[model samples]
Target: VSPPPPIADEPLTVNTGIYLIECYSLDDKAETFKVNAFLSLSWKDRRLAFDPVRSGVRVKTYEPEAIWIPEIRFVNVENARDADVVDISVSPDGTVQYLERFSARVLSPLDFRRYPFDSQTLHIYLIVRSVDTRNIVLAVDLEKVGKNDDVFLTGWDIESFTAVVKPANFALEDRLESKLDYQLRISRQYFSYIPNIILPMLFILFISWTAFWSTSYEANVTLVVSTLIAHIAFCILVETNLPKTPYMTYTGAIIFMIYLFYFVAVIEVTVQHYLKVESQPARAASITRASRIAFPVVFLLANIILAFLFF
Candidate 1:
């Protein structure tokens, strides 16, 4: 046997398809992966004027990184074992480029953006093959040199190239990083619409409070029942709009306040009806004194506890 005719080299041609740069990871502990990737631009003709610097491309970090000038290598070429390495190199020409270096870590099907940037598309791929598990490793960490902002590529002529893989495990990750960071700068549009939901909640809750002025127990009961329905319905509606999280959200705080208020209102109405039916004037005075003191104490405590939930 002639060594099974030697293993064939994998191709380096990427199929025709559009791929979005996004943060990806299969690991559960660190579901989000952040990595650095940018478009490496060059022209086939020297006469063509191209400036990689001073582009509008920008990226930002939600949190600062602990490292400075830290660089990692990646192997992106397929078949040619010698071509399967990238080194962080800055030349005398002041241009940073990948140089031949040591073998790289096995790159999984996840990529990341080092920082935030505007909503723009970046399309690039390394010549890779499936035979090399380490192929298509992208270096990503927090470190900045000079005025190097997070933006990678700005205006450039659209072009395509043939590669063996279309960045299956070789693509950039965390497209949302840009959106997530920039989101802090803008007022959340969803919050503006929250009042629409709150208005209905207020109406329902206020109806329950009307029990205080109700002359009849039946009327108070009707309002209390409606208040319960409103609170439960609002709970569902608020939960639908917000994420399921351990800490209470602003909507949750509001819902809790409403529910507690309704509970107290129901109890107060029940006690009032009971005291009125007893038909004793002195008993009524005692009930009134108990309420004035008890209501304020309980309401004050409830407000204090709920305030912590908000903070």
Candidate 2:
């Protein structure tokens, strides 16, 4: 009699997923963030299934290091700290669960258009190698994780988190691949910017507006020029802190408005001085008085409009 038909190998399907986020931090200089969290891998093996009472196997736990694991990696990792398989367990139904705690710094792209008021989405791309959709699949327990108040990134608030899975084709190896994208929605803390940047700059502009009250045209010119220089200095400070981008941010627009106001003030002072030199003191006085009221009104209206348009 021929030997028993050789048993065919069973195809294994692994479910890879992520769990809790223990900690998170953003690094502005490196354009990356550190995430410390738990990663999970689970699969079922029918051959390993057994009734604990019948088999007298009180516990069903195993070392994940001893079994085959998918070669998974974070495609955007800049610097990885600690990532290792810490513990694993098996259920009576033959479900094996593996857990890993990872602390890794991953690359992220940021948009500063709204700057302090901006909301950004950060992505974590998880890729699996030497595996296709047929053998394994990626999933996320959105209900278990996402909104965590424990995230401690200064000047930023964690809004929400989500994950998506998709299949991608690799041209180099001519194989289909699976990928998971973990997204983090974050918004900047604007309260800090209010005192450091917004209020100070607004104060400077107000001082420049006071130039309209000066009796001496020379003093008015001097005051407006000083305020203009201060505004430019503040712009420089803000520019240095942010990454260079082609699009104009809301902060940039505010700076431009201040510059335009100062420029108009310089011109107003010059024209008023010319009128006084031409011996039309009455007209110069009239124009200065009108500007005293009109300047503040226009400034206030423009800001209101800007706030309405941008916010």
Q: Tell me, by lDDT, which candidate is best.
A: 2
lDDT of 2 by residue, 137-244 (tens): 455545444434675677787776777755452434665455678888788888988888899998988888877776588789888999888998899998787777
Once fitted onto the true fold, the runs of candidate 1 whose alpha carbons sit more than 4 angstroms away are 1-187, 190-194, 281-309
lDDT scores in order: 0.39, 0.73
Could you tell me the lDDT of residue 222 within candidate 1?
A: 90
List TM-scores for all candidates, in order: 0.41, 0.84
Error in Å for residue 103 of model 2: 1.2
In terms of lDDT, model 1 sits at 0.39
Distance from true position, residue 50, model 1, in Å? 17
The CA root-mean-square deviation of candidate 2, after full C-alpha superposition on the true structure, stands at 4.6
Relative to the true structure, candidate 2 reaches a TM of 0.84
Candidate 1 lDDT, 1-311, residue by residue in tens: 00111124322221121121222221212222222323221111112123445633332111112211112223322222222223333323223333232221122222111101112222222332222221222222112111123322222122321223213353334221100010001112234344667567667766676665554889889988877986797688656633345555555665777677778777787788888887764665565466555655775687578555543
CA lDDT of 79 in candidate 2? 59
